Design a protein around this ligand. Structure first.
Ligand SMILES: O=c1nc(NO)ccn1[C@H]1C[C@H](O)[C@@H](COP(=O)(O)O)O1
Ligand SMILES: O=c1nc(NO)ccn1[C@H]1C[C@H](O)[C@@H](COP(=O)(O)O)O1
Lengths: 289, 289
């Protein structure tokens, strides 16, 4: 109970329990998992706090760069790489594309992935250079409309799971849908993750959606509230138990705060240089993985 | 702390926690809610079990008839009515259609609600007497194809949230999507519900998705596992508090068991007369509501 960072103490319990009571799907490719199906955690977003884990470092520049690019509607991993964020690099190089049958496609065309769904759900996908405006349903714009105009609503959902388009995507969505909620003048987010690695993706995903809620709040003139993180397949790679065991023994620091250093016109008006992360205090970089 | 029915003893606390920890959203006019954003619940489905609540009775004829109807792909609430299930009657009769602008629509054309999404996602909706076979993505067929050919998949997802078709729908989807997961040759389901009444709809919903998992499992040759119930807006109506306080008093009975009385060719081959609910033992009806 008596922890500075109580929200992170909790995530450490979650890993502990997956280790303690999860089921193994083993192998010898070295890719085996330990799994709990169905998990839920909450983090407080109040006072500018963003849940970037302090016990293991999170790649803030990729979290930061990739989210701006999601919102921007883009599906060219080329723009992302120009900023030296390479997390989408293996999924867009020519060998991945051709192996998937996507042989009429230029490098970096990831297909109708997240940005495309978020801002043009149901538009007809052509390529990453096509202008898709007025096409498909812009879910992010509508999300902003609802928080402002209909705060009590229980249908503030934005989704990237489009069954119609999933075969054209380089990967299926892993963060599948989210729900915003306003109560008492504070904005909240619940996120559904179909599947997540608890030493890599779940932590990066956590930080991505916290940033989104801080960004979306500033736009609708609300104070941020709580992020609910619901996991579908919350798993651990069993060849980092040693690392996760160390990390489970590190007392967390406080979470960093987000500062927006100028005014924004819309949710399309953030940039790298106006989002400040203050006091991201982190433990030493971990040995095994 | 030995409760015959632990999974439902939990339901009582769930409500109890909304009662004592929840957020008010009052109204003058008798429809006020006390609400918690972000909740999760698990239920055992092993050895025939199905989470139909014993402390307040659930309408099984409605659960049964309506789930069979979703699967069929149907959007005609007149079919649902022919069987004397009246849950969709309000939203399909003509004062509703017209007040939504759906004035070229016959009674009971509910639009592209759950069944149209579940079996023809992305198809072009015309009416409820239209043959859409081969049109759109059959998500239930795909869910079955994966459970069987690809049990390990972390992508077994059927979802009724289609932003393109939402405006043509008499009601937004409350149960927005679900994930399926196999471990141990036992099949579980995690349900996402954007919003829910904890004394009317969450318990009807619980039973529907539990019955679906028993049905889908029998078809794939798997044992039923566990049902994970996640809600976004989990709420209790303010007027029903007197009633829920008693219901919380009541001690649960063991959950009933489902039995299938003949073999099935597909998920399209269940009927009412072959799904048997054994020993649904319940408390008396509530003196308040
Ligand atoms: O944790 C993740 N977060 C992601 N963000 O999108 C993407 C992936 N992952 C992890 C989850 C699984 O380990 C893997 C996805 O593989 P899949 O669920 O089998 O498609 O990547
Ligand atoms: O609990 C529910 N379960 C449903 N499943 O079919 C459908 C509706 N409901 C309840 C939840 C809300 O109280 C209400 C609809 O939520 P709303 O669309 O935000 O009004 O009905």
């Amino acid at each position: 109970q008596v922890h500075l960072n109580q929200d992170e103490y909790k995530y450490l319990k979650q890993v502990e329990q997956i280790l303690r009571e999860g089921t193994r799907r083993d192998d010898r490719t070295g890719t085996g998992t330990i799994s709990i199906f169905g998990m839920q955690s909450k983090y407080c977003l109040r006072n500018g706090t963003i849940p970037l884990l302090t016990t293991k470092r999170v790649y803030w520049k990729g979290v930061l760069e990739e989210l701006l690019w999601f919102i921007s509607g883009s599906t060219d991993g080329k723009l992302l790489m120009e900023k030296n964020v390479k997390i989408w690099e293996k999924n867009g190089d020519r060998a991945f594309l051709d192996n998937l049958g996507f042989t009429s496609r230029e490098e970096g065309d990831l297909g109708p992935v997240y940005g495309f769904q978020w801002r043009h759900f149901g538009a007809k996908y052509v390529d990453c250079h096509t202008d898709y405006s007025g096409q498909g349903v812009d879910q992010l714009a509508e999300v902003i409309r609802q928080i402002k105009e209909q705060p009590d609503s229980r249908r503030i959902i934005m989704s990237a799971w489009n069954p119609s388009d999933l075969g054209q995507m380089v990967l299926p969505p892993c963060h599948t849908m989210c729900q915003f909620y306003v109560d008492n003048g504070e904005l909240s987010c619940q996120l559904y993750q179909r599947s997540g690695d608890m030493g890599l993706g779940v932590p990066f995903n956590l930080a991505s959606y916290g940033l989104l809620t801080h960004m979306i709040a500033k736009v609708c003139g609300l104070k941020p509230g709580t992020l609910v993180h619901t996991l579908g397949d919350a798993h651990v790679y069993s060849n980092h138990v040693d690392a996760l065991k160390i990390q489970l023994d590190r007392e967390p620091y406080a979470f960093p705060k987000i500062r927006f250093t100028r005014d924004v016109a819309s949710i399309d008006d953030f940039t790298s240089d106006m989002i400040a992360l203050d006091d991201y205090k982190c433990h030493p970089k971990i040995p095994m993985d």
